């Protein structure tokens, strides 16, 4: 399952670098997807800091493993039947915001359960939608500037 593997790698790397404040070393689309995610993921968090803080408070995540409510939230987001990259990137960006807060309470927190939770909603529930547009190329091109 290359799409799942690729998606988990991109999302994990973003969440990890957001949470630690440092980048990782060592495909071409994955690199470009990550650069795009950095740019647009940082962008969504801007202007929406107050809203993200508010959502984090309501989420009331107890620890690094407490991802059930976030998964439920993400399923609910898509439950109007609409799928687009602005929603997807916002979900990933909020995941980054949450990963950051987990590191503040406990420095040795794995961001991986959160990243798996998001990748799972994305890849499992939007599988054919993603495949149709060559996966992350859809994302790269949508946000291309």
């Amino acid at each position: 399952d290359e799409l799942y593997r690729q998606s988990l790698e991109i999302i994990s790397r973003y969440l990890r670098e957001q949470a630690t404040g440092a980048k990782d070393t060592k495909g071409a689309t994955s690199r470009k997807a990550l650069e795009t995610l950095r740019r647009v993921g940082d962008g969504v968090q801007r202007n929406h800091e107050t809203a993200f803080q508010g959502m984090l408070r309501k989420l009331d995540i107890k620890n690094e493993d407490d991802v059930k409510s976030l998964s439920r939230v993400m399923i609910h987001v898509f439950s109007d039947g609409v799928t687009n990259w602005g929603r997807i990137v916002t979900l990933i960006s909020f995941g980054a915001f949450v990963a950051k807060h987990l590191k503040t309470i406990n420095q040795e927190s794995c961001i991986e359960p959160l990243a798996e939770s998001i990748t799972d909603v994305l890849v499992r529930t939007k599988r054919d939608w993603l495949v149709k547009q060559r996966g992350w190329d859809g994302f790269v091109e949508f946000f291309h500037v």
Partner: peptide, 23 residues
């Protein structure tokens, strides 16, 4: 919900805004 409904509403709002901005 109700917290989970509110979080979802908010994420959807920002996501559609952000989609619209680039579309």
């Amino acid at each position: 919900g109700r917290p989970e409904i509110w979080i979802a509403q908010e994420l959807r709002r920002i996501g559609d805004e952000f989609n619209a901005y680039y579309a």
